[model samples]
Target: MNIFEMLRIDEGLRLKIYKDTEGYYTIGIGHLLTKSPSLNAAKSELDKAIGRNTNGVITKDEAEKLFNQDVDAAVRGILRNAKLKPVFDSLDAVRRAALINMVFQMGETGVAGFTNSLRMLQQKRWDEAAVNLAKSRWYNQTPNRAKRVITTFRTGTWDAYK
Candidate 1:
C-alpha cells in the first residue's frame, strides 16, 4: 500500500473527474454527492456521507487521512480473503504490489473467483498464475496492465512501464 504503485489501489480506479454513480454526484474517490460540485466548491460530499457539516472542499490534510483509511480497509480485505494473504506477503515488494493491485481492481470476493489463478499464485507458480490471469475479462479490458502484473508474478521481478 505504497504511493505511486497503483496509488495503493489506484487500481486504475482513480477519479480524475466527477462522475455519476447510481445518481449520486461522486468525485475524488467514491465520495457521495449532496450539494453540487461546481455549485459548491466549499462543500464536501464525503463529509455529508459520514455525518458532518457537508460544506467545504476536502482539504489536503482531510483527503489524505480519508484515503489512508481506504488503504487500510483494502489491506484488511485482501488478507481476510485468505486466498492470497500469506502467499502475497511471501512475495517480494514488487510481486506483492502486483497481487495487491489486482485485488484492489477485483475486490477480495471477485479475485477469489479466479480459483485457478489463486491456486497457482499460492503455489508460487508464476507462469501458470499469469496464464490464468490473462484468461479473463479483466485481462482483455486492460491487457497492458494485466501483462505487467502477470510478468511480475511469473518472473518474481518488476517490469515497470514508463
Candidate 2:
C-alpha cells in the first residue's frame, strides 16, 4: 500500500511522490501546471502549508502568507464547516496525517470530519477510535479509501510510504 496505490494518480495528472526532510513522503499535485510561474511558485508554498513547523509549532503567519487570504479563508471555512475541533484536539502525528489526508481529499468541510471518532481519540480508546473511524460519513462515502486509512490507523504502523 504505497502512496501511489493510495492516490491512484494517472499519468495525465503528472503527480510525483517525494520525500521531505524528515523522510516523510508527500504527493505533488498540479505538476502539469508547473509551466505557469504563479502556480509553480505556489508549489513549495502549498507544501509548506501542509507541512508542520517543528513538533509543537504552528506558524500561522507563514501559513497565511503561503496560502494568502482567499485560499486560507477557504481552507479555514472548510475546516470550520467540517467541525474539526475534536479531531484537531485529540490528534497525534499519525492521526493528524490521516485527518489531513481526508481533509485534502474531501475538503475540510467534507466527509473527513467525524465528531464521534474524534471523541474516541480524545478518550484514548483505540478500538473505539477504529470503530468510529470506520463508521464515518467519509467511510460510507469512500469505502475503499476509508478502509485503507482506517487499517493504517488501527495497526499504528502507518507511515508516509504506506
Candidate 3:
C-alpha cells in the first residue's frame, strides 16, 4: 500500500470510518474532529485543518484551500515549521514518506515534540531514532501506526506507509 492507498478517497467508507472512530464529520486530531465538512471533501478539509494546526498562522479556511491546491507544499510547510529538513534529507524515499505520513497523522509540532527522537534523528543515530520513534506519545496514541513507521525506518521499506 502506498500513501495514496492509505489515504485513498473512500467517500462512504472513509466518512463512516471517520465518524465511527471520532463521532463527527471531520478529521481526527487529538480530541477534535475539526469543523464538519462534506464526506467528499474530507481529505482536503483534513489537510487544511492540518495546515492551520501546524502553521499556527493560517486560517482554517485558507489552509483548506492551500491543501487542495498543493498537498506537498502543505506538507513541506509543516515540515519547515517543525525543522525536519535534516531528517528528511537523510532519509531514503521510503523512510521519508513514512515519516511524512507519521507527521501528517500526528502533526509536525506533535512529532517535533518528541525531543529525544528528533535528537537521535539529527545525530543520524538510526537505532536510537527507531527506538525513540517507537517510544513517543504518538506511538502510545496509535500503536499500530507507530509500529509500522518504526518497521519502515528500520528496514528502509514502504510496507508500513503503504
Candidate 4:
C-alpha cells in the first residue's frame, strides 16, 4: 500500500473544520491552529483555505498532506520550547503522550502555569505530580481528561476518567 494510504488509515481523513483536542480550530485532518491565538486570525485563514460557500471541507488526499506537514511543524514548535525539554527524555511513552495531550489541551503558555505539577514531575515524584495536576484549574476545567492524564502518571497505564 502507498504511504498516503497508511497515513489516511491511522489518522483518518477529516473533511470538515472542527475543534481539535486542545480546542484549536483545525481543518483537513489534524491541521491544528493557534492553541490560544486571536480567533479572528485563525478564522480568516481557515475561511480562505476552505471555500467560503462550500461547507469548508477538503478531500482525503488534501487532509493527509496537510496533516503530515502540520504535525511536523507542531512537533518542532513543542520541542523548541525550553520548558518542554526537561520532561521529554525522562518520560515513558505513556506519560510522555499524556504530557503532550495535556499541553495540547492547555496550550504551551497555559501549561507553563503549572509550576508545582511540573516541579513534581521533574523531581520524579509521580504521585505528587498527579495530586498537583488534580488541583489545577485545568483539572477543574476538564476533570475527566485530567483524571485520565494524572492516573497514567500514577498507574503507568492509560484509563478513561469516566
Q: Each candidate: how many clashes?
A: 3, 0, 1, 0
Could you tell me how far off, in angstroms, the CA of residue 133 lies in candidate 3 after the best superposition? 1.7
lDDT of 1 by residue, 23-83 (tens): 4354444333443545354244456543566453454445555556555655788788777
The best-first sequence of candidates by lDDT reads: 4, 1, 3, 2
- Candidate 2 structure quality by residue, lDDT tens digits, 1-162: 433233332111213333322233323331121223353344554455557433222244543342233334434654575367555556665555555555545556554446677667667777778887876656786676677677656654564334
lDDT of 1 at 46: 58
Q: Which stretches of candidate 4 lie over 4 Å from their true place?
A: 1-14, 18-43, 47-55, 60-74
Query: What TM-score should be assigned to candidate 3?
Result: 0.61
Task: Encode model 3's per-residue lDDT on 1-162: one tens digit a residue.
Answer: 654344332111221115533344433222123445455455455546555333123344543443343446435754686467677777777767666666666567766677777677667687778887876666786677678777777777756554
**TM-score head-to-head 2 vs 3, winner:** 3
| TM-score of candidate 2 versus the correct structure, residues matched by position | 0.46
Candidate 2 global CA lDDT score: 0.49
Angstrom error at residue 12, model 2: 9.6
Candidate 2 residue runs with Cα over 4 Å from true position? 1-86, 111-113, 159-161
Model 4 Cα lDDT, one tens digit per residue, 1-162: 222332233234567767765577676755664565566666666666554533455677666666666555444555777777677567776666666655544556667667788778878799888988898777786676577668877765644332
